[PDB]
Design a protein around this ligand. Structure first.
Ligand code: HEM
Ligand code: HEM
Ligand SMILES: [Cl-]
Ligand SMILES: [Cl-]
Ligand code: NA
Ligand code: NA
Lengths: 713, 713
């Protein structure tokens, strides 16, 4: 059936902005997962899960009698898709159960793991999401085996369709680097925003880079991909060693015995895949990765045996029964238990990537400290596992249930508690009047608030105006934020805030985070007034101001807008067309196509462009809130041509006279080109639309201002 | 960026069921287009449109000084995509403005026509949809040029994204037959549901079949494709001759001069395409189809000259300036006006397909009658133009405005007006009690009402339970409808209705259409009682009974369910998998994926299957309304295998014992296989879900029962 994407494969795709509609959601429109979960008997769930660990099912028998290792692997894969570059991936939406993740080669036989959990999911129903359950199962695995976890938060609502993520351009699973769609270039530079070395892997290849079994070189890939998942070297060592304390790998026979992944399998498979023709196809005969490694003498108990073995033996290269490269301690004794035959023992074995923790010099320092001080290893692993499994959950205000850790971690971009009374409506009105009387302009006010609020991304729920991190390093110096202009605005606002707060009784005060957003609301209200309309923009107090010491500068770097179509800004020259980057940013802001369209055309006429560029400012009344962007963009009396100097900038000239009327970028002119976006622009460019435009702009503005306000959820 | 459709190109696609969400719609949730239209001053719009006809714009100058031909072509192409097989295409959604229709080769330069209309669209805003405006413009064109139309109805609400329609499998525009994805097989048999001879054409190729200029063979294609658009011979001749009374074709130079279609063009084209390098690119130099024909001596006025010329000359084959086949009148004087140069005249010309009207013997008799009796031609063309442009609008209750024709037409599947008091809630209770006391079972009652209601399709808004057409030819004999069982149900219900109606005062009576639906509601209520739930199903009276004379049997044939997964029914063996046919039917019923899911699982346990099949009846309490379908489908204690006799039937056996528990089809098992459908099934198969399942079932049931109830809109 030939489709529009077949005929016009490079047209812009807006369907990413209308995923997750009420149409695809089985739950009622009023369903609130937080309320369901808060009444779950979490202790009862955990008892069920503990019992499950040692209750083998014949269709996928448990190694050693215990599913703990499989479940820890399942939880780490759930979390292990996360990328800091964009925040996409991670455990927070339970996407392991949908395509394509459910059928990635690295996720083989995790379909069995998910299926073992159906009875428990069924029993508790809507009160526990899959997304929470995958993680909670990994925690119960660890606790059942003697490991003390750092805690657990619920609150990951389930989703109902695949997210649209760029996982790479390769058309072959696992393709080695250097091919026609290579994700590497230069000196082994992985393309942003990817965080895995091959399509279908989680971070790295367990045999070594493109299959070369060199621990030293494997360590370079580990370091790079874990950094792209926001983990430093201490965390990375703790996670790998901690995970490979438990369980085993599966590679009993040749890989050619393994059949179709779940999305390819027959309907009779009922959502499972990788059926194997090797012997019984399961249990002792299981094939998953093709490696056949068991790291420790007690695979079902926490220990410090991973590092005892790693340092205590010398290692030689060998092949598993499937032909993969792996390492064995020859002339160790046969001290490692077999998974199913109590009369068989095995020598210690290791992956290439495990040996990286010893042979990379920076890793070896850390591994040696963890070997000599296994309580330090256990604390680091507990901390890193909580980070791994909660990194995309957003502000601590989202965390639910009785096991939330009290300690506030730097990586959570923490917001101080508010311990004072909040401003009321009359106070908000007084501050809005003060702001407008200071001389700050509509453009200054809207641009500052937009800069503060628009760092939010729904992928990982990081960013937004709460915290007033605009005023701190590094956001105060991001080029998109116009650092000198911003500094002058913030000085003026801080003086207003100091005056107001000095005049109060009773402990009432306004934060700078709330004032930045309230000042942007005053800009919007004044722009509506400039156009002849009286509107009140909604405002919700309660943001707090974070300190510099509460702000990790390096982790904040990935939130820098290097393309922000809403401010007609491109930090440099990218391969991806600017209009594609605009839709990406709209998706991160959680905007639909209509909301993106109204928002952009309003920002243009309010003066939100970086550098006060005239591109897209299709109005003769700048700083008034009107639909002039749309009316002027859609006027057929204007003819548009790319400039000689820059093919991405366009001049709009009167068709009859040739007189120059406007300039625009691709981001501006796509709204007059793309057949769906132009249908939207037409609505807002119609003669009956001025009221609609103002109402819808104010609504979307308020939506952006409140993205991170899970304290009000 | 590699997508799930790249990896798994034959996985079932559910996004068709969640198009048209509130997310992509710019209008607020409560917007009601009928209410907006009803307050439009349609007379003012029509004055503006008459003014536009001779307001030539320099970027696409009007032929003869009058855009009327261009606009009639625009309206006929709007409507001309309709297919009776599925109801998809047509004018009623304004899909011409979106991909792919906006960029079909046969729609070349209609982007100009639509852009001429923007000022009028802009002026009236939301009170006139594009979909209504395209048709209204065509009517005004005709009226401007001297032809009195039959009438016009508004009410076509705009849509905001492309509909998902199968337009063919070819990967080359215009591909001639017999390619790897040929739409023809056999003795020129066009594949259902297609109604065009080549990808990107409307009905037929104006040069002849696959480009061969044989008028007689052309006529076979005309007849077949027009019939697939619901037109008979009289209507087809009236339409073609009527259309080609106006305007001209455009083929002034080689087609190699014409550039990218709109979806391919540069952003600076601002939504237009087919830019031509031939001379001025427009007006006298225009290139659209490549043909250069002007049919009549007065191309801007209604006349009887089409048939005068067709019969009055003999025709010679020639080539246009672009090299397309066309015909010129032998020995004729230069009597046809030029479009731009008053000093030039041209000989009469015709397309191959125009000569079909003379050289096909059935057409010739009609053509000759219209030539001799031009009042008959004029009435036929007015009637056909109204049918062409309204065939997909649905029941007359949807027709809005002051120009609706009063005459009721057979093709409208007319429903008689209700002229008596309707039953009230007390009466509905009394009739549900009578139904349950007759002995009719849950299975009988649900199956009959489902058979009556599920003929509805949202594509053209045909079908549904109003009318009680289930009791007429041909629906009473459709295999899916179980004719002998149905006749016994209808006899029992007709006796109940006769007894009730005989006992009334004051003119009160119940229709059989209402009683069928109310009897199905009673069956649902009884099934809920069987399962221990106290449920009242909503019911809205007001349906009327249509007569046999009001029911065109041939036109009803396209509404026969040859696949209805809701009743586990397939009439024969098709190429398309049965689960794909299910999603198609759910799309016609306007169901989302959750609604499809809940409705199937309920119908299975209520006994709706055709032939009382046990396939998918995953319950030990048939005729009770429970979520058993889902709980038993998802039980991992059951293993599924395809049968030896039939690979599309599956046996479910106890995994431990081997005992046979259930059988099922692909439609049943896809809910356990497809990762998005299985997620939905899980919600309804959870321990907390029985009440949710019942409530959601009753809601979707009532939805289906009410699909055609535009009298209540
Ligand atoms: C360099 C990063 C890593 C590599 C390349 C890697 C590689 C793999 C491979 C190839 C398997 C075998 C799959 C099978 O054949 O069954 C696996 C198993 C496992 N991994 Fe990792 N791993 C990585 C990091 C992690 C981390 C961060 C954790 C968790 C904290 C983890 C926990 C596990 C567990 C528990 C198993 C055993 C599964 C079982 O018993 O069924 N791994 N590892
Ligand atoms: C067998 C069915 C038909 C065929 C193959 C056909 C073919 C075409 C073609 C090839 C053009 C020339 C396009 C261009 O070069 O500008 C055209 C023009 C046009 N057709 Fe048809 N036609 C069909 C039926 C219809 C019908 C049913 C109507 C309307 C009732 C219609 C009304 C028009 C009008 C008014 C024009 C002139 C456009 C102008 O003045 O710009 N045609 N036809
Ligand atoms: Cl994601
Ligand atoms: Cl359609
Ligand atoms: Na994410
Ligand atoms: Na349709």
């Amino acid at each position: 059936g030939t489709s529009n994407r077949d005929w016009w494969p490079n047209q812009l795709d807006l369907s990413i902005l209308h995923r997750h509609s009420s149409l695809s959601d089985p739950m009622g429109k009023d369903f609130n997962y937080a309320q369901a979960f808060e009444k779950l008997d979490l202790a009862a769930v955990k008892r069920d899960l503990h019992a499950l660990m040692t209750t083998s099912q014949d269709w996928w028998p448990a190694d050693f009698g215990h599913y703990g290792g499989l479940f820890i692997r399942m939880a780490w894969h759930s979390a292990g898709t996360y990328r800091t570059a964009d925040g996409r991936g991670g455990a927070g939406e339970g996407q392991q159960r949908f395509a394509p993740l459910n059928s990635w080669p690295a996720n083989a036989n995790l379909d069995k793991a998910r299926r073992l959990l159906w009875p428990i999911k069924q029993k508790y129903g809507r009160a526990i999401s899959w997304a929470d359950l995958l993680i909670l199962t990994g925690n119960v695995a660890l606790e059942s085996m003697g490991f003390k976890t750092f805690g657990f938060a619920g609150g990951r609502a389930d989703t109902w369709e695949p997210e649209d993520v760029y996982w790479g351009s390769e058309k072959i699973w696992l393709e080695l680097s250097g091919g026609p769609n290579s994700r590497y270039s230069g000196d082994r530079q992985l393309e942003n925003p990817l965080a895995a070395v091959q399509m279908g892997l989680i971070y790295v290849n367990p045999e070594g880079p493109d299959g070369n079994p060199d621990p030293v070189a494997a360590a370079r890939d580990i370091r790079d991909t874990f950094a792209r998942m926001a983990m430093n070297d201490e965390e990375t060592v703790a996670l790998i060693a901690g995970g490979h304390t438990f369980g085993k790998t599966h590679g009993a026979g040749p890989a050619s015995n393994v059949g179709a992944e779940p999305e390819a399998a027959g309907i009779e498979a009922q959502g499972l895949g990788w059926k194997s023709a090797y012997r019984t196809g399961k249990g002792a005969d299981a094939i998953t990765s093709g490696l056949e490694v068991t790291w420790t003498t007690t695979p079902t108990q926490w220990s410090h045996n991973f590092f005892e073995n790693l340092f205590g033996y010398e290692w030689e290269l060998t092949k598993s029964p499937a032909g993969a490269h792996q390492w064995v301690a020859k002339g160790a004794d046969a001290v490692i238990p077999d998974a199913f035959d109590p009369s068989k023992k095995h020598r210690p074995t290791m992956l290439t990537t495990d040996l990286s923790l010893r042979f990379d010099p920076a890793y070896e320092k850390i591994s040696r400290r963890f070997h000599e001080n296994p309580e330090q290893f256990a604390d680091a692993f507990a901390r890193a596992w909580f980070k791994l499994t909660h990194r995309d959950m957003g502000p601590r205000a989202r965390y639910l249930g009785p096991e939330v850790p009290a300690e506030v971690l730097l990586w959570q971009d923490p917001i101080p508690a508010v311990d004072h009374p909040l401003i009321d409506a009359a106070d908000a009105a007084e501050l809005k009047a003060k702001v407008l009387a200071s001389g700050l302009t509509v453009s200054q006010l809207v641009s500052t608030a937009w800069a503060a609020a628009s760092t939010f991304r729904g992928s990982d729920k990081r960013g937004g105006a709460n915290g007033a991190r605009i005023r701190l390093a590094p956001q105060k110096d991001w080029e998109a934020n116009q650092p000198e202009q911003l500094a002058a605005v913030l000085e003026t606002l801080e003086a207003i805030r100091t005056a107001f707060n000095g005049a109060q009784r009773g402990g009432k005060q306004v934060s700078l985070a709330d004032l930045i957003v309230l000042a942007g609301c005053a800009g919007v209200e004044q722009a509506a007034k400039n156009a002849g309309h009286a509107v009140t923009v909604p405002f919700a107090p309660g943001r707090a101001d974070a300190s510099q010491e509460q702000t990790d500068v390096e982790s904040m770097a990935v939130l820098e807008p290097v393309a922000d179509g809403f401010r007609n800004y491109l930090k440099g020259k990218y391969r991806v067309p600017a209009e594609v980057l605009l839709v990406d940013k709209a998706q991160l802001l959680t905007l639909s196509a209509p909301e993106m369209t109204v928002l952009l055309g309003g920002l243009r006429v309010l003066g939100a462009n970086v550098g006060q560029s005239r591109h897209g400012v299709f109005t003769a009344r700048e700083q008034a809130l009107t639909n002039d962007f749309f009316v002027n963009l859609l006027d057929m009396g204007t003819e548009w041509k790319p400039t000689a100097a820059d093919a991405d900038v366009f001049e709009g000239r009167d068709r009859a006279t040739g007189e120059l009327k406007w300039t625009g970028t691709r981001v501006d002119l796509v709204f007059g080109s793309h057949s769906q976006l132009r249908a939207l622009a037409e609505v807002y460019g119609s003669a009956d639309a001025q009221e609609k435009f103002v109402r819808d702009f104010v609504a979307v503005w308020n939506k952006v201002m409140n993205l991170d306000r899970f304290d009000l959820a």
